[PDB]
Design a protein around this ligand. Structure first.
Ligand code: VMI
Ligand code: VMI
Ligand code: MG
Ligand code: MG
Lengths: 549, 548
């Protein structure tokens, strides 16, 4: 049993090639059984077993930093750096992170899962080691073919190529046979190129890595791997499926609708759209910037693009939404799935920034579906906005059960009104998927004699006349949102009331503006007090304090 | 008379002789010098593309063939050849010709954004649209400078363009080398057909290359070498100077300070820093994303980077600030010059987003200097924050005399207090460049018998204890900021008060969340009612409504 004997990378040093073959087979058996139980990125990690062995046989981590781009493929790295006994807890609260973690190991450097950044870290680290006079530190960046489609890699390669400071660029390419990688050639950029190397020939990978280190300047080592290598399998109604079906339905009648994904046609629900309309689906790679600006170009050509990008990753396209789409008043609809807490993938995956970021965009119209019917209606309304950008945001998981409104008042859906004998005390503005929690809050407060109107504004931005009209009829306004509080929906509602000379007290119940550790979505929300029990308690205290000072 | 006056549109070039195009180029240069020299416009970049622009409009049929300029500051010759040569007396003036292409001005203009490196992405989308709508024989031409080509968007776009035979012609206008600011990487062997290098001042040779590209039937790169300022040798007391001097002084003692610019060492005040510490200045090209994440890597190696990027361009680095710097709690200081209204470059240049964008970043610390001494002071404080990102933001132009405080309470500077005998009616939270306005507003209100405390919070984010402590002592809080109101400083102050159970009425006096047309900074502010007269009037109304 060799895996159990690996205390750290140096224990690989004197293994025979036969022993390394046996060890790699032990590693695959481990991954298959451990990751099947916890969930996680099985396929990408099976693909890098020999690559990771070779990296830790040639380089001296962390004196030689091994930076994983995206970081979802560092399980083998963790198993070879003292953490093989920790995988029962993988991606669980308090357990092993699904990405590298500096708190777990000195061998881990970058915790962000946002792709294509590794080479930029590498350039800065190499610059730092020169400035501090550290001898013989070899920065190694492991970059997938998908990550290599992102613009950050081009900026970093241009900067790296301007210097003889050694950076070793390991391209982990599983988009081709020895797929989702670059269409552009990177054999002739002006940087030394080694390969293509069979990334499941462990000794060949070491030979190439050793040649790269000897060269003493920037070098690209192109390694070809197979996703899921060694495991054939790898080699409840959700919001996504409701979106997919609704988009197809609208596009059957409207030929001007096109769809764009940044490398995630399946997860965004666009695969089925492309099957029906193959000429109207574009996969631009891991390139959210180009997704949005190419959408602007499509709209300048008369089309109405639907850009489906998971909330957190849309951060990369802020300036394109602002200067390429909004400045030109172009009809681009953005669909942000995985909005709000996602939980298991940690801080860099939670979609908790979109309402705050999109709120800076002049004239933007943003909707947060509360259920399946409202996702279908609001998508149709967005597709009917022809003079500027629109966005829909909704969480991962089971679609919310339909909640029909008591009445619609200036675009706002009234979901609950104060019961007879109770007054209009609290206006609870329920954003998106928090409608059920708001209704439960209203029932608890009812039992305490506190009258609550629950509304779903539908179109959260801009804040509508209906919200302002109902706000003046209540004594306290509470916004409940699955988004960071800073610049979020609650702050936007407060700002709109004050602009309208309405000074009803407002409170912003949302996610504190912090980076969250991995846990289940329900665990994160409970730890933050985003439960109907805790929210009702807070509102009780605010109501009792009214006029006390 | 001359030929330029006879050019009604591009087709009037069609039958000119080579000798005539040569005379016309010289007339265009003389015109550009007459109307742009010493005005603040982009003379050099436009002198560089006289022959290129003539050749483009001799080969392509705009706008059936869209000609998309990257950045757009080099489209003056394009405008002269598309019916606007009589409009240059108004260039970059309120109500006059834009400094960038404008769809309202001309069917020949497509992209109005000045943010660089986006043209090829527009071009990919446009080519895709023409295919989907069945338009024949529309050749999309993107004119991309060598500097713009250092931006990541170009690589994403070229990757996508290369996946299709849809005709996109990539005209690289390279003035970073002689026939530097351009890519270090080669683009001769990307898998895309490459033509050149072409002498960009040989108008005939440029036409020959463009015709070869136009008939190729697939994407093609045409590499044209131009000389910035061709034909005009001269083209061939500021906040920024205060920053420059302060940074050099701190780095003399702190060897761990490094500076990074995204292709603007001169305008950001970093040239003088590199001259003193040449190993500690990095120019990463037009690559704000790489600037921030390589800053993260430098910080991971034990250094304290100072990233100087103009406010509006920092939008491009939002996710790197968030997931590469802030997530790792790294000590990177961001210095945002041209913060607030800049005016003459129009909507895509005003630095009116940074307080709103930065406020989303968990834990961030953001300062807005009110004067030179506070820039020096707050920069030093930023450099001493070792556990997360800091930012300073300040406006273009000259810095006036220091504004002295009456006292500092909880980090907040009290600039004025209600006169003896007046009540504490208004807390006027003056952000950065608007401290003089706030003091003028307070004097007007004083004459009306309204007592105002004016504070400079210095560190606007997070909102400080001092702001909360003073707010409860007043009947009204007004935040005055040179930033968009949505998610800006005023909304942040309001949110902090409400989180602390303080319901004192707050008003957010800032820039409406709109894209502004070009005009002078003072004109934009006046048009918005951001003057001490107008703001005092609004506050008078709010105070009258509260009574007491
Ligand atoms: C179970 C839930 C787990 C969610 O996490 P995910 O969605 O699996 C992940 C890691 O995140 C990835 S990997 C990936 C392709 C890598 O392709 P590539 O680099 O070739 O790697 P490979 O696996 O082939 O080895 C993409 C597109 N994403 C999302 C993503 C999108 N946009 C940006 C800027 N950054 C991202 N990080
Ligand atoms: C006096 C007021 C006028 C301000 O306007 P500026 O600052 O001149 C301008 C146009 O903006 C430019 S041009 C330029 C180099 C172009 O280099 P290149 O493409 O090679 O052009 P060329 O050599 O032909 O001039 C750069 C860096 N900037 C700023 C800039 C920075 N970051 C981003 C994302 N986008 C920008 N647009
Ligand atoms: Mg891959
Ligand atoms: Mg140039």
């Amino acid at each position: 049993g060799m895996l159990q004997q690996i205390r750290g990378p140096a224990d690989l040093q004197h293994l025979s090639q036969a022993q390394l073959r046996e060890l790699a087979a032990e590693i695959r058996e481990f991954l298959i059984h451990k990751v099947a139980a916890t969930g996680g990125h099985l396929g990408p990690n099976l693909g890098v077993v020999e690559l990771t062995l070779a990296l830790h046989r040639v380089f001296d981590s962390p004196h030689d930093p091994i930076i994983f781009d995206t970081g979802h493929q560092a399980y083998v790295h963790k198993m070879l750096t003292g953490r093989s006994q920790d995988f029962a807890t993988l991606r669980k609260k308090g357990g092993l992170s699904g990405y590298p973690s500096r708190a777990e190991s000195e061998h881990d450097w970058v915790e962000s899962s946002h792709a294509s950044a590794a080479l930029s870290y590498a350039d800065g680290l190499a610059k730092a080691f020169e400035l501090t006079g550290h001898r013989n530190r070899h920065v190694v960046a492991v970059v997938g073919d998908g990550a290599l489609t992102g613009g950050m890699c081009w900026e970093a390669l241009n900067n790296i190529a301007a210097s003889r400071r050694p950076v070793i660029i390991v391209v982990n390419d599983n988009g081709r046979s020895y797929g989702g990688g670059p269409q552009l050639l990177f054999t002739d950029l002006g940087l030394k190129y080694v390969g293509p190397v069979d990334g499941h020939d462990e000794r060949a990978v070491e030979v190439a890595l050793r040649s790269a280190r000897r060269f003493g300047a920037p070098v690209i080592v192109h390694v070809v791997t197979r996703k899921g290598m060694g495991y054939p399998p790898a080699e409840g109604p959700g919001w996504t499926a409701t979106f997919s079906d609704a988009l197809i339905g609208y596009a059957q009648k409207r030929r001007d609708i096109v769809a764009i994904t940044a490398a995630m046609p399946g997860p965004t629900g666009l695969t089925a759209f492309g099957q029906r309309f193959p000429d109207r689906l574009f996969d631009v790679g891991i390139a959210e910037q180009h997704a949005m600006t190419s959408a602007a170009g499509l709209a300048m050509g008369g089309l109405h693009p639907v850009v489906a990008i998971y909330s957190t990753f849309l951060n990369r396209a802020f300036d394109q939404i602002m200067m390429d789409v909004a400045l030109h008043k172009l009809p681009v609809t953005m669909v942000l799935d995985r909005a709000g807490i996602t939980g298991s993938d940690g801080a860099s995956h939670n979609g908790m920034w979109d309402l705050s970021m999109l709120g800076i965009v002049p004239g933007i119209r943003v909707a947060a579906p509360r259920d399946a019917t409202r996702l279908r209606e609001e998508l149709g309304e967005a597709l009917d906005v022809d003079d500027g950008p629109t966005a829909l945001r909704f969480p991962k998981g089971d679609v919310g059960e339909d909640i029909s409104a008591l009445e619609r008042r200036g675009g706002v859906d009234v979901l609950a009104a104060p019961a007879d004998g109770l007054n209009h005390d609290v206006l609870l503005v329920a954003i998106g998927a928090f409608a059920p929690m708001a209704l439960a809050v209203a029932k608890r407060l009812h039992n305490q004699g506190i009258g609550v109107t629950v509304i779903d504004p539908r179109w959260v931005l801009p804040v509508s006349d209906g919200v302002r009209e109902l706000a003046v009829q209540h004594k306290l306004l509470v916004t409940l949102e699955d988004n960071g509080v800073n610049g979020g929906a609650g702050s936007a509602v407060s700002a709109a009331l004050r602009r309208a000379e309405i000074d009803v007290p407002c409170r912003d119940v949302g996610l504190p503006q912090e980076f969250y550790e991995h846990a289940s979505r329900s665990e994160v929300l409970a730890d933050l007090g985003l439960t109907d029990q805790d929210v009702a308690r807070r509102i009780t205290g605010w109501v009792a304090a009214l006029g006390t000072g």
